[PDB]
Amino acid sequence: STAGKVIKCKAAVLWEEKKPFSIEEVEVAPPKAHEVRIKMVATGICRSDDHVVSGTLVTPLPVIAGHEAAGIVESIGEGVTTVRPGDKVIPLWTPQCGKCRVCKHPEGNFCLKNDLSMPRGTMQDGTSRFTCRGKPIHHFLGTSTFSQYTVVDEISVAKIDAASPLEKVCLIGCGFSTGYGSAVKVAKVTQGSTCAVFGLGGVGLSVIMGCKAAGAARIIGVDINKDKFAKAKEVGATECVNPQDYKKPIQEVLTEMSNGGVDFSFEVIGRLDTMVTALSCCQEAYGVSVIVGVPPDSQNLSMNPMLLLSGRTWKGAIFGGFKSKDSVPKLVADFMAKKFALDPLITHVLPFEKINEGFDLLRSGESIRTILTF
Amino acid sequence: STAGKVIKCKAAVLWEEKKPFSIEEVEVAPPKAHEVRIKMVATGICRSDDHVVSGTLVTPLPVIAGHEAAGIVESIGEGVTTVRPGDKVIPLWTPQCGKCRVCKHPEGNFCLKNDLSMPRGTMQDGTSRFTCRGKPIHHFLGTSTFSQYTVVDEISVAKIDAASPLEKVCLIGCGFSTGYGSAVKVAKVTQGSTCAVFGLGGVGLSVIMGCKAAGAARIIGVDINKDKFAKAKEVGATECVNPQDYKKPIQEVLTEMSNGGVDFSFEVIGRLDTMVTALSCCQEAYGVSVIVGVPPDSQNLSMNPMLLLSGRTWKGAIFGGFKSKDSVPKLVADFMAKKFALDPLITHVLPFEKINEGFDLLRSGESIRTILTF
Ligand SMILES: NC(=O)C1=CN([C@@H]2O[C@H](COP(=O)(O)OP(=O)(O)OC[C@H]3O[C@@H](n4cnc5c(N)ncnc54)[C@H](O)[C@@H]3O)[C@@H](O)[C@H]2O)C=CC1
Ligand SMILES: NC(=O)C1=CN([C@@H]2O[C@H](COP(=O)(O)OP(=O)(O)OC[C@H]3O[C@@H](n4cnc5c(N)ncnc54)[C@H](O)[C@@H]3O)[C@@H](O)[C@H]2O)C=CC1
Ligand SMILES: O=CNC1CCCCC1
Ligand SMILES: O=CNC1CCCCC1
Ligand SMILES: [Zn+2]
Ligand SMILES: [Zn+2]
Ligand SMILES: [Zn+2]
Ligand SMILES: [Zn+2]
């Protein structure tokens, strides 16, 4: 009964930095040309959503955040052809326009139509579909999933298996895919190798899954919260180390353990020091280090370039290097085919109304992923 | 006549930093077990040898530098099996012991027996085979080619084509292979790509040859010495730019020229700033940047890791990524087969006695490579 009409629904609005989310009534406009309105069913709480709160990730406010989710299309705008009302879909915070230089590149995935590099907080047309208390509200990465209904550009949505469990596959919208791809696609982990994974949250655990799927023989988790070790080992870690427990730099500990350095290392936290530690801990002649974590805004790191001259490779990636629209449905099909697991990542399931409690669990280190159900 | 006997011959000894080399009479001991004494025929002047003089590269003094050379085996020590007296050889300043974890890796080449990371200035056994005026003199990178005769460990020498032109193939000992490999092996340049090469000396020009051999469609040379542009174009550069010509930083110029960044960039100079510039000038989502240049001893650079998070790859290599003993003979064979050219890199040929003049030519910007003949 909503097609072609404004919808009034509940959403979590962040009015300013460093404040809790405010559950409010918002008004969601119907979709314009090449836009899709989606009924959200489940959304995950990613550390990147917290970065918005903390100021680590600068984006226009007030905003409706959220970028890891899954739902059902409610209606479509003029000219849409990739989805229809009723389809199961996952919003793509990294779009895939299919026409830019990156999209046409065989490897690149950071589409030039993204709203991450210089955020505008809007739809591709430069406007907003949301109003709250008479005020237009900004969008987030073109997705804004912390709302019962959202509107997204066609290039930022993927159709998925009609049989998918939305409360699980929302993870494929961000956390899982990012981590998993960082291992199998960006780093290209090899059979029998030794890997080090710094950070054992939702993304890091997905990195471990990817290292295991690639055939790694040894996987070392690194985290200051030891309650994360058990889960890290269940998904593939052979060993875990806690930097707080040691008298010397963890890079020396990891280098000794691995008889001279690891094959592949991953920074999945978001700290300058751990980015350099991760690079240093890989074998100097052939090691590969991938940065996944997001540091805070603007601050530069200092490092010795001879760490690279010796032969190391250092790189980073968005969304695990996956071309979004092409990949998401394939990942869901692999999940349905039982090629990987998502349950281990989920520690909590809460109603959407408890979003702030979900963020509390993240900050306190008591959760991996909290899935919010609408 | 000389086997098993001390040889008295001329060599260039560097007694102190920032001094001219001193032509001296030195005593060269016969080879000990698993060592090989070689009569040098030709040696090139590489910027790395100048780094020893300038203090850019710290290594024990006094020393006999030189590492880009070709010669003929004069005698061998007990147990040697890979070369015989009379064989044409090229000394290897990166060894290949064949036994360490790097030598056994399919890609890595920075053998753990190198004398580059933590230089001792000696043979593998920790002693020296050179005496001058009764004082022991240090070796350099296990090669010490600035002497009529040198002694090298077996893992630091490769036999080559008996008909090879030693005054040309010496370049394969360093400059050419480093640049060529950095493009074809380390960067893995792709057909139709756009490359940027920072530094148009012997190594940078070799990088251009590798980019051309890889099929690059566009190659932009960057040097503050415009006198190098004609040769750069001769070997494959489509364009050349001089940063001194511009008010804008060179990365902005390069990014604009390449419609958003190059595919592959190479720093072949040895400056911290240029390393970051080169990285920044490659495409943000899929660009690759390789560091080849050597900066002053132990100095760190400052950079924003968001440069990598977007998807850039940053790496470095020693000797073009080539496993030394395995590759050098193959490279010589390729040269003999006309698969690449070495002449365009040689601007001057001088007697060894004029070593200082050759270093002067390098520092003034008049030469690409000077070859010293004994
Ligand atoms: N590159 C991409 O495309 C994306 C990047 N990210 C970023 O990846 C990072 C991780 O994301 P989540 O897993 O959601 O975060 P999380 O907060 O769930 O996990 C972070 C882990 O790092 C641990 N940690 C914190 N400080 C540490 C330290 N000094 N030393 C060792 N361990 C430490 C924490 O105890 C925690 O377990 C975040 O920065 C996020 O913004 C998130 C997904 C996509
Ligand atoms: N990674 C490895 O295995 C090896 C590293 N190297 C290093 O490669 C570098 C190049 O070696 P060569 O070709 O022999 O040196 P070179 O002195 O012949 O050439 C260097 C070029 O850089 C230019 N240049 C200087 N400052 C510049 C600036 N701000 N901007 C743009 N261009 C500038 C110079 O005019 C010159 O043409 C040296 O640092 C050397 O030590 C040398 C070979 C092996
Ligand atoms: O978490 C999802 N997206 C992230 C990607 C890295 C920059 C912060 C936003
Ligand atoms: O130039 C020859 N060898 C180089 C290798 C890189 C550090 C300086 C010495
Ligand atoms: Zn996320
Ligand atoms: Zn695109
Ligand atoms: Zn050299
Ligand atoms: Zn070795």
**Three-state helix/strand/coil letters over chain A:** CCCCCCEEEEEEEECCCCCCCEEEEEEECCCCCCEEEEEEEEEECCHHHHHHHHCCCCCCCCECCCCCEEEEEEEECCCCCCCCCCCEEEECCCCCCCCCHHHHCCCCCCCCCCCCCCCCCCCCCCCCCEEECCEEEECCCCCCCCECEEEEEHHHEEEECCCCCHHHHHHHHCHHHHHHHHHHHHHCCCCCCEEEEECCCHHHHHHHHHHHHHCCCEEEEECCCHHHHHHHHHCCCCEEECHHHCCCCHHHHHHHHCCCCECEEEECCCCHHHHHHHHHCECCCCCEEEECCCCCCCCCEEECCHHHHCCCEEEECCHHHCCHHHHHHHHHHHHHCCCCCCHHHEEEEEEHHHHHHHHHHHHCCCCCEEEEEC
Q: Which residues pair with B266 in a beta bridge?
A: B197, B290
What SS3 class is residue B239? strand
Q: Which residues are CB-neighbours of B197 under 8 A, at least 6 positions away?
A: B204, B207, B208, B211, B219, B220, B221, B222, B232, B237, B265, B266, B268
- Return residue ranges of chain B for CATH 3.40.50.720: 179-316
CA angle B231, B235, B237 (to 5 degrees): 85
Please say whether the beta carbons of A223 and A278 come within 8 A: no
Which of B171, B142, B176, B140 shows the shortest CA–CA distance to B157? Answer: B142
Task: Write the Ramachandran bin of A125: left for phi over 0, alpha for psi from -120 to 50, otherwise beta.
Answer: alpha
Q: What is the CA A97 to chain-centroid distance, rounded?
A: 19
Kindly state the tokens that stand for A359. Answer: 């963020």
Question: What does each C-alpha distance from A91 to A13, A116, B77, B227, B228 come to in angstroms?
Answer: 19, 15, 70, 55, 52
Task: Please list the residue range(s) of chain A that carry CATH number 3.40.50.720.
Answer: 179-317
- The residues facing A40 across adjacent strands are A71
Helix-, strand-, coil-residue percentages of chain B, each rounded to 5: 30, 25, 45
Tallying the residues shown for chain A, one arrives at: 374
Dihedral of the CA atoms B172, B175, B181, B182 (nearest 10)? 170
Token pair belonging to A30: 């119907």
- CA of B13: how far to CAs of B21, B62, B127, in Å? 6, 7, 17
What would the 3-class secondary structure string for B303-365 be?
A: ECCHHHHCCCEEEECCHHHCCHHHHHHHHHHHHHCCCCCCHHHEEEEEEHHHHHHHHHHHHHC
Residue in the structure block whose two tokens are 């090691």: A287
Strand order in the sheet with B22-28: B7-13, B22-28, B130-132, B135-137
Q: Give CA angle at B63 (B57, B69), nearest 5°.
A: 80
Adjacent-strand bridge partners of B71: B40, B89
Tell me whether residues A308 and B295 touch, CB distance under 8 A. Answer: no
Q: Give the CA radius of gyration of chain A.
A: 20
Q: Does A275 touch chain B (CB under 8 A)?
A: yes
In DSSP terms, B289 is beta-bridged to B265, B314
Which residues in chain A are closer than 8 Å to B304, comparing Cβ atoms? 298-301
Alpha carbons B369 and B364: distance in angstroms, whole number: 12
The answer to whether the CB atoms of A315 and B311 lie below 8 A apart is yes
Distance CA B24, CA B70 (A): 21
Ligand showing the shortest atom-to-Cα distance for residue B112: 8
CATH superfamily of B7-173+342-373: Medium-chain alcohol dehydrogenases, catalytic domain (3.90.180.10)
Inter-residue contact A65 to A49 (CB < 8 Å) = yes
Residues 6+ apart with CB under 8 A from A127: none
B61 with B74: CB under 8 angstroms?
A: no
Single out the residue of B127, B135, B108 nearest to residue B33, CA to CA. Answer: B127
B102 neighbourhood in chain A, CB within 8 Å: 283, 285-286
- Please state whether the peptide bond connecting residue B119 to the residue before it is cis, i.e. omega within 30 degrees of 0: no
**First CA to last CA across chain B, in angstroms?**
20
A317 to chain B: closest CA residue: B311
Distance CA A358, CA A343 (A): 17
d(C-alpha B78, C-alpha B96), whole Å: 19
What is the three-class DSSP state of B258? Answer: coil
**8 Å CB contact between A265 and A196:** yes
Q: Which of B178, B191, B310, B312 to mutate to test the interface with A (most CBs of A within 10 A)?
A: B310
Distance, CA of A319 to CA of A78 (rounded, Å): 29
- Whether A10 and A23 have beta carbons less than 8 Å apart is answered as yes
Q: Does residue A325's CB lie within 6 angstroms of at least one atom of ligand 1? A: no
Which residue's entry shows tokens 């579909």? A129
**Which letter, b or e, does each residue of B29-42 get, where b requires 16 or more Cβ atoms within 10 Å of its Cβ?**
bbbbebbbbbbbbb
The whole-angstrom separation of Cα A13 and Cα A22 is 5
The residue type found at A222 is V
CA distance A328 to B93: 49
Active site annotation includes A48: yes
Backbone angles phi, psi at B8, to 5 degrees: -110, 120
Residue whose entry in the numeric block shows the structure tokens 């040689």: B346
Question: What architecture is the A179-317 domain classified under in CATH?
Answer: 3-Layer(aba) Sandwich (3.40)
What are the residues whose beta carbons fall under 8 Å from the beta carbon of B338, sequence distance 6 or more? none
B371's enclosing H/E stretch is strand B369-373
Question: How far away, in angstroms, is A48 Cα from ligand 2 center?
Answer: 41
- CA-atom Rg of chain B in angstroms: 20
Q: How many residues does chain B have?
A: 374
Nearest CA to B347 out of B369, B364, B365, B363 is that of B369
- The C-alpha atoms of residue B197 and residue B219 are separated, in whole angstroms, by 7
Identify the residue whose C-alpha is closest to ligand 3 atom 1.
A48
* A355-363 helix and A47-54 helix, angle to the nearest 10 degrees: 90
CATH, range B179-316 = 3.40.50.720
Question: Does A203 contact ligand 3 (Cβ within 6 A)?
Answer: no
Interface test with A, best of B51, B101, B198, B286 (most A CBs within 10 A): B286
**B105 within 8 A of B26, measured Cβ to Cβ:** no
For residues B344 and B235, is the Cβ–Cβ distance under 8 A? Answer: yes
What's the sign of the alpha-carbon dihedral A48, A52, A57, A60? positive
**A46 and A202 Cβ atoms separated by less than 8 Å:** yes
Both tokens of A374, joined, read 């609408």
A101 touches chain B (CB under 8 A): yes
Reading the block at residue B85, the tokens are 């007296």
Under 8 Å between Cβ of B236 and B208: yes
Measured between CB atoms, which of A283, A301, A310 is closest to B305?
Answer: A301
Alpha carbons A202 and A215: distance in angstroms, whole number: 20
Q: Is B286 in Cβ contact with A108 (below 8 Å)?
A: yes
Does ligand 1 come within 6 angstroms of the Cβ of A52? no
Neighbours of B79 (CB within 10 A): 10
Q: Which of B283, B285, B291 sits opposite A308 (nearest CB)?
A: B291
Measured CA to CA in angstroms, residue B210 lies from A240, B165, B371 at distances of: 43, 21, 22
User: Which residues of chain B lie closer than 8 angstroms to A105, CB-CB?
Assistant: 285-286
Reduced to 3 states, what is the DSSP secondary structure of residue B277? helix
Distance CA A147, CA A164 (A): 21
At B313, give phi and psi (nearest 5°).
-115, 130
Torsion, Cα A324 A325 A330 A331, to 10 degrees, reads 30
B78 touches chain A (CB under 8 A): no
Whether omega for the bond prior to residue A62 falls within 30 degrees of 0, making it cis, is yes
Q: Decide: B369 and B50 in contact? Cβ < 8 Å.
A: no
Query: CA–CA separation, B74 vs B84, rounded Å?
Result: 8
Those residues whose C-beta lies under 8 Å from the C-beta of residue B44, and which sit 6 or more positions away, are B68, B69, B170, B171, B173, B174, B175, B202, B369, B370, B371, B372
CA distance B3 to A324: 69
Resolution to 1 decimal place, in Å: 1.6
CA distance A361 to A373: 16
| Chain CA centroid to CA B227, Å | 22
CB burial of A60-69 (b: ≥16 within 10 Å; e: otherwise) equals ebbbbbbbbb
Q: Where in chain B is the domain with CATH 3.90.180.10?
A: 7-173+342-373
Cβ atoms of residues A172 and A243 within 8 Å: no
Residue B322 contacts residue B177 (beta carbons within 8 Å): yes
Single-letter amino acid code for the residue at A140: F
Could you tell me the two tokens for A166? 């939305």
What is the spatial distance between Cα A368 and Cα A179, in angstroms, rounded to a whole number? 13
Residue among B264, B286, B280, B296 at smallest CA distance from B190:
B264
Q: Count H helices and E strands in chain B, helices first.
A: 11, 18
Beta partners for B262?
B282
SS3 B226: helix
CB-CB contact of B327 with B160 (8 Å):
no
Pairing mode, strands A135-137 and A130-132: antiparallel
Residue B100, annotated as binding a ligand: yes
Q: How many CA atoms lie within 13 A of B52 on its CB side?
A: 29
Q: How far apart are CA B200 and CA B208, in angstroms?
A: 9
Helix-helix angle B355-364:B47-54, to 10 degrees: 90
Crossing angle, helix A272-280 and helix A250-257, to 10 degrees? 30
Instruction: Name A372's bridge partners.
Output: A43, A350
Report yes or no: A200 and A231 within 8 Å, Cβ to Cβ. Answer: yes
**Among B33, B116, B302, residue whose Cα is nearest residue A285:** B116
Report the alpha-carbon distance of residue B352 to residue B372 in Å, rounded.
Answer: 5
Dihedral angle over CA of B44, B46, B52, B54, nearest 10: 120
Helix (H, G, I), strand (E, B) or coil at B247: coil
Rounded Cα distance, A13 and A8, in Å: 14
Give the three-state DSSP class for B257. helix
For ligand 3, whether the C-beta of A152 sits within 6 Å is: no
Q: Tokens in use for A164? A: 């998918």
Q: Which of A9, A132, A170, A174 is catalytic?
A: A174
B339 contact partners, CB below 8 Å, separation of at least 6? none
Single-letter code of the amino acid located at B92: L
Rounded to whole angstroms, how far apart are CA atoms B291 and B314? Answer: 8
Judge contact between B53 and B14, C-beta under 8 A.
Answer: yes
List Cβ neighbours of A165 (8 Å cut-off, separation of 6 or more). Answer: none
Contact B14, B22 (CB under 8 A): yes
**Residues near ligand 6 ion, CB 5 Å cutoff:** A 97, 100, 103, 111
Q: Annotate B155-211 with DSSP letters as a single string.
A: GGEEE--TT--HHHHGGGGTHHHHHHHIIIIII---TT-EEEEE--SHHHHHHHHHH
Is A305–B298 a contact, with Cβ atoms under 8 angstroms apart? no
The total of other beta-carbon atoms located within 10 Å of residue B137's CB is 27
| C-alpha A306 chain-centroid distance | 32
- Count CB pairs under 8 A between chains A and B: 120
Sign of the C-alpha dihedral computed for residues A96, A98, A99 and A105 taken in this order: positive
B204 φ/ψ angles, rounded to the nearest 5 degrees = -65, -40
Cβ count near B352 (within 10 Å): 20
